[PDB]
Amino acid sequence: QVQLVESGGGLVQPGGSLRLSCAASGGSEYSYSTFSLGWFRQAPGQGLEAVAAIASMGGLTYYADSVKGRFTISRDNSKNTLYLQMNSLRAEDTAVYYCAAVRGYFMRLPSSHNFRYWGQGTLVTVS
Q1: Is residue 43 helix, strand or coil?
Q2: DSSP E strands: which ranges in the chain?
Q3: Closest among 82, 36, 80, 40 to 59, alpha carbons compared
Q4: Strand, helix or coil at 61?
Q5: Which residue, 58, 75, 81, 97, is most buried by CB atoms nearer than 10 A?
Q6: Residue span of the structural domain in which 78 resides
Q7: How far apart are alpha carbons 82 and 41 in whole angstroms?
């Protein structure tokens, strides 16, 4: 039902910052806040990995080892939008970033299997 669209991707210099957004549409009968959200990424030559997530019911956040303390996941429910703030970007951060959502929750950094809805992805190139 819910469609997700990433935005904000682009080229950034190493050490720089960047914010990505993800707009959700559809499923109006469904409270946006009931969805747990997450950011994943797939760097060239690697598999899809979890980056950050925020659980519905309490808003607890989880981050991947290499981004903890550098990235921040947040949401603007009035806009049905998910954001991710990135700092101190490195070449290893180059990848297509995907937002995901699910009507359920998790209590640790969730894997891709935990999410039902997915966006098409946005490319972030760090050079």
Answers
A1: coil
A2: 3-7, 11-12, 18-25, 36-42, 49-54, 61-63, 71-76, 81-86, 95-102, 117-118, 122-126
A3: 36
A4: strand
A5: 97
A6: 1-127
A7: 15
CA 44/CA 81 separation, integer angstroms: 27
Q: Alpha-carbon torsion 3, 111, 20, 91, what sign?
A: negative
Cα–Cα distance for residue pair 124/42, rounded to 1 Å: 10
**CATH number, domain containing residue 103:** 2.60.40.10
Instruction: Give, as one character, the DSSP assignment of residue 91.
Output: G
Resolution of this model in Å is: 2.0
Q: How far lies 76's CA from each of 15, 21, 28, 73, 126, in Å?
A: 26, 10, 16, 11, 26
Please report, for residues 11, 100, 121, the alpha-carbon distance to residue 95 in angstroms, rounded to integers and kept in the order given. 11, 16, 10
